[PDB]
Amino acid sequence: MAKRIQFSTVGGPEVLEYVDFEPEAPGPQAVVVRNKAIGLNFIDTYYRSGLYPAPFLPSGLGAEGAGVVEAVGDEVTRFKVGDRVAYGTGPLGAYSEVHVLPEANLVKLADSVSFEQAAALMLKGLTVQYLLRQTYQVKPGEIILFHAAAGGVGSLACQWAKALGAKLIGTVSSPEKAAHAKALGAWETIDYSHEDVAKRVLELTDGKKCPVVYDGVGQDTWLTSLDSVAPRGLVVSFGNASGPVSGVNLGILAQKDSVYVTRPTLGSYANNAQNLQTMADELFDMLASGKLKVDGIEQYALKDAAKAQIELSARRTTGSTILIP
Template sequence: MARTTSAFRIEAFGETSVLKMTEVELPEPAAGEIQIEHAAIGVNYIDIYHRKGVFAAPLPLPSGLGMEGVGTVTALGAGVSGFAIGDRVAYVGGPPNGYSQARNLPAARALAVPDDLTSETVAALIFKGLTVEYLIHRCRKVEPGDTVLWHAAAGGVGSIACQWLSSKGVTVIGTVGSPEKAKIAEANGCSHVINYRAEDFEARVKEITHGAGVDVVFDGVGADTFAKSLNCLRPRGAMVSFGEASGPVDPVPVSSLGAKGSLTLTRPSIAHYTADRGEYESAAESLFGAIRAGIVLAPEITTYALADAAQAHADIEERRTTGSVVLVP
């Protein structure tokens, strides 16, 4: 039987004012779907891209919002196996509808949640943790002894990355925007921290590496950091541009990558690294194992009521948050 649930819908792209919470009909799950009641919902920068319509493929409007969550299975569609009513599951991806009290979800996107992990911890870590997992293990495999530059090292993704990389014997140079965030990055394993508001990060990276440059740059910031980041790479280094928090990156002449040292440039998406069910489950097992081993700890978690999603977006955009942001229905 269909029911109603509270959920956010956007009918136009724009600023936080386009976020509207409303009552919507929630039908019985279709074949291959499960229905879940949310316990915690992760907020990510991709949600802001979707809200603004600046992502590579803008959402068809009207649309929901939100790409990850944790909840309890309340109904099963036809043909679903491997899950039962009452199971606790997490998900990344699927139709954007995470900002809701309850939703239907393709069962192929659901992951069993270990009993010893809280819903808020998983919501804080699952999307960002799987992002780090694919970036450092499969997009550009980082090896012990490598040196990497990670922008926004005190953010949700950056905090996890610094912990995971430092545990592997990687030298991490992190950039941050304040002395307070520098302390967070240091606590999470950064060997060197650069406050980009007070120092030229390109000059500092060259100083730290004695002019050699870094093996990899992981850049989720975009316009403000991209050009100088290329200059921080050693010959045959790799630039991984995985976000545009400060705005889109200007086009790059292919020939410039050769001139700067036969560099590699990629713009990956988590969708392409979790599309295969086997890879998706394996990545989650790797992440949950790192959490259990104490390698990856949940960063500072800032919680907002689901109804306050617009404020959460505003705080993230103004860089008033550190760690992870979670909505609680």
Template sequence: MAHAIRFAETGGPEVMRWEPIEVGEPGPGQVRIRHEAVGLNFADTYFRTGLYPAALPAGLGVEGAGVIEAVGPGVDFAAGDRVTYTGSPLGAYSTERIMPAEHLIALPAGIAFDTAAATTMRGLTTAYLLRRIHPLRAGDTVLLHAAAGGVGQLFTQWAKLLGVSVIGTVSSEEKATVARANGCEHVVVYTREDVATRVREITDGVGVPVVYDSIGKTTYQSSIDSLARRGLLVCFGTASGPVPPIEPMQLAVKGSLFVTRPALADYIADPAERAELAGELHDHLTAGRLRVEINQRYELADAVQAHRDLEAGRSVGASVFAI
């Protein structure tokens, strides 16, 4: 029988339950997918805690990779196709599920299922951050928080391919080593160095044109203070909590700054754009230009421990659930 992680109330990791489920047959526009691997992302904790609302009871997880077992009417995929996906509806933490075919992305044979589960969300996030948010040019220098994380490792590698230098922040020397190994040119250990001061030193007092901040509450001020005149703060995550309201006059005083809070869903909503970004990601992966290290693997039934590790900062780089 198929199983899934579900939760009936918001709260800590302990609210998650490993339960048997009935999957059924796909309807029009749907497929039944058998997962081979499932992604573990910090955003999953936002749904579990209620920061992102979900109708309860609910499944969990938005990223998976596997094989289509059955298709409903009006679907372009076929049974046996390898696919990956990221996005709603919730429910990726499962051995099997019914999935709208419109959200699926064909997975090339050269990309392993666990690699896909570790990179579809992170890779597409990296793709839109580097290729859609700001017109970066070779020679630019940007600031990236959490440079040793799953997005951080892909981001620094991809940025290097574009000729963009990355100043990355990390919490420890261990993570600094990881960031450097992935192409981070300058690493700031924020637990013992002031980020904005180091950024000004590295950039000869100018600051950076773009800061990519997935941490939020504890880093947004140092992000603002690191920007060059007319720079852009990209708040794409809130690992430490939501960003407090930013007074517009502060943006003027700091150099006529800009702030955006993008969401991946709005950059892959258009099928053609999603295909373009996924194609670029998959090309880099199959050619070996992007390396993916999966440092944590869990059984789906161990999702409680996986979330505890994630929220405690014990995870380095990508994590997946093996099915």
């Protein structure tokens, strides 16, 4: 037996339960991990709420975490007992002290990186990586728009953009978030509380707007993104913080001067146990070189995942957050 967070019905935070469960025996190509730190993500709430379906109930939660390998499948050769590993993709279940997942979702952790850093770096990091390096190759000098720049993903985005030599315009909901995003590396900041993001973008870009707009908030900010992207530019809708975006008429893209739109998922980019090693290596390379910093990690006990999840959703807190089994 071991403890885990799970839900028997989809809904709000009150849904989550901390209980004992019987950990599965490792499949031939699976690995048993000893969660030392567990990630907290919006994706966790989307499963908890039912936006995304769970194969069955009761269901575990989360796919980001880091720990030590405790058991390995007969066919696993890349890993061995005692190895320090991290993951940001795979089946549900990170919200527990023991997590069993395919070996293809696991990467080795250098000694220099702690479990806490990995749990607060894996998923958002790989995400920012595919967003700025794959979905659209941001070049130095380019002025790009990134919503919720002070959030979990946006904060990392602020740093990576600066390293890229790009000018990132980050939207925030308060002057405190503005200072946070700027200190990290945001070129310019826009508080959507008292100024129009679309109009500020226009003056900041000298009427040329942005080649690409990264938007993880979803609905509330879909229109703004369309008004901030340059003709034939790209709008990347990668999240649903304010709710998914729908009811869209393709003719809207023509109206906005022939723009492009995409809705990517980390799973698609890190599609294999190998297209991941690649982005994972780049992500840690950024960390090692000091280009990415994770300083100040708020820690919630696993048994308090509901409380942590409530704060994430509220979107009033800033800085890295992780769960600790």
